[PDB]
Ligand binder design. Structure first.
Ligand SMILES: Cc1cc2nc3c(=O)[nH]c(=O)nc-3n(C[C@H](O)[C@H](O)[C@H](O)COP(=O)(O)OP(=O)(O)OC[C@H]3O[C@@H](n4cnc5c(N)ncnc54)[C@H](O)[C@@H]3O)c2cc1C
Ligand SMILES: Cc1cc2nc3c(=O)[nH]c(=O)nc-3n(C[C@H](O)[C@H](O)[C@H](O)COP(=O)(O)OP(=O)(O)OC[C@H]3O[C@@H](n4cnc5c(N)ncnc54)[C@H](O)[C@@H]3O)c2cc1C
Ligand SMILES: Cc1cc(=O)n(C)c2c3c(ccc12)OCO3
Ligand SMILES: Cc1cc(=O)n(C)c2c3c(ccc12)OCO3
Ligand SMILES: [Zn+2]
Ligand SMILES: [Zn+2]
Lengths: 230, 230
């Protein structure tokens, strides 16, 4: 309040722990007066593939299809497919984008990778060049809220998975920061599946709690040294 | 010896630089007398979404759908969807898997991320426990062949985009090594669209030339140190 929040949510099951974290993010920010929108990608059957159907009407060059060039020209000429233009308007208006997802292979599920390949297009997200700290979406906050199968200890620098910031890098720096976002600190709920149940309700409530002061937070100093450095 | 290769390929335009790197891989390994298979994900309209459509049997927990639990059970039961089992059969038989793709947001295009999410399921590619050096696909080689928009210097330490290896981590270590593969050194073909004809032509021949000696190669030490250093 008086802010707009988009939650991009990527889980198949409403009773999941991811559902719960999305449902408290809605409740708590609703409570505070914020304007809230949720893109439930599985329930929308969101199309993850970057293809020629993403451009309506006719293309610059049907001899050799280049996806980046074509989507860029289609953004400028307002001829993107409507699923994409709908998401862009939500992002455009949002002051905070929250991504709520289970970690798949040290990254986002494919349905959410496709939202990012398709919606964050050239002309809207960034414009080769006019990027990083000057990316087209500067002023907006972005926040990853990730659940993991693996425990907190596995995600340290000398444990099996290496350090959490290592996988964060393509998402946080290569995507969010590249587009102009200022990135709040990931929220990582480590290993909900191996409960309890008690410790679940508490991970959830720390999420609720943190969202009480979300607007006070400072953005991470988005650098190579934050993700890897000493 | 006789060898089987799978090329998992993710570009939309047969005439692209990616198309050409894939075709010369086919020509060169074909010429050596290797068995070669290409999964052309876009021409297959490959399904990247991990949904409950991926299980044809009675669900293990039909009240609360968890994708990892259900695909693991579906795999032991032989109740996965046929597109997934067709890919697993190609991977199972392959001695080498080459991924051929344009970098999208510091990672794979979503259609390829969906191949990772849905094909590399628990019970086939890995087990809890039975991961990293004990992953189920032990024995097999894997190689990333990645094209970029950025140079060829932007991809160093400082370094607009940071070191190239930073973004390889989730793919190489978190996915491939985790499934037991030994990973060979990425083929990164920087900035083809900027590049002039002599540089394109020669990037294409440098790949051809490298494949001549591919079974002579040793895998990378797939570590935090290789990826990040210092
Ligand atoms: C393809 C694939 C790739 C993967 N790659 C990785 C990886 O790279 N790294 C990694 O660490 N893990 C990985 N995983 C594992 C995955 O990240 C975890 O399975 C997932 O994050 C668990 O979250 P969930 O929301 O789906 O759990 P859920 O099982 O849906 O939730 C956990 C439990 O909490 C319960 N619950 C729901 N809401 C509440 C609430 N309100 N209060 C109390 N309890 C509640 C649920 O009913 C359930 O019992 C991968 C999994 C898959 C399927
Ligand atoms: C959603 C999205 C996200 C992206 N994210 C990133 C990112 O994170 N980092 C980054 O660096 N880049 C990124 N890019 C840029 C992208 O990776 C490049 O556009 C891509 O790697 C170029 O490969 P291509 O095959 O499409 O090149 P093409 O445009 O197809 O190749 C350029 C030229 O090569 C020619 N060619 C093909 N074969 C040959 C041949 N054998 N001999 C001579 N010429 C040939 C073609 O005719 C063409 O004219 C992103 C792009 C998109 C669309
Ligand atoms: C890469 C990875 C690391 C990890 O710590 N865990 C628990 C994983 C997992 C998967 C797939 C990948 C991983 O499915 C269920 O649990
Ligand atoms: C993250 C990134 C780094 C980069 O160096 N380049 C060229 C990019 C690009 C994209 C999207 C992201 C990137 O579309 C066209 O070129
Ligand atoms: Zn950054
Ligand atoms: Zn590794």
């Amino acid at each position: 309040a008086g802010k707009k929040v988009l939650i991009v949510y990527a889980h198949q099951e409403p009773k999941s722990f991811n559902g719960s974290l999305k449902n408290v993010a809605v409740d708590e920010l609703s409570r505070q007066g914020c304007t809230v929108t949720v893109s439930d990608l599985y329930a929308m059957n969101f199309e993850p593939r970057a293809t020629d159907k993403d451009i309506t009407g006719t293309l610059s060059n049907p001899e050799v299809f280049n996806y980046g060039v074509e989507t860029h020209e289609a953004y400028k000429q307002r001829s993107l497919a409507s699923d994409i233009t709908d998401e862009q308007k939500k992002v455009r208006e949002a002051d905070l984008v929250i991504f709520q997802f289970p970690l798949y292979w040290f990254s986002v599920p494919a349905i959410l990778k496709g939202w990012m390949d398709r919606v964050l297009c050239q002309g809207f997200a960034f414009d080769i060049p006019g990027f990083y700290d000057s990316g087209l979406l500067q002023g907006k906050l972005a926040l990853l809220s990730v659940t993991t199968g693996g425990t907190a200890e596995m995600y340290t620098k000398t444990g099996v998975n290496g350090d959490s910031r290592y996988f964060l890098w393509p998402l946080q720096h290569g995507t969010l920061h590249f587009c102009g976002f200022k990135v709040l600190a990931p929220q990582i709920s480590f290993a909900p599946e191996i409960a309890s149940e008690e410790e679940r309700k508490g991970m959830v409530a720390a999420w609720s709690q943190r969202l009480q002061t979300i607007w006070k937070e400072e953005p991470i100093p988005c650098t190579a040294h934050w993700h890897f450095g000493q």
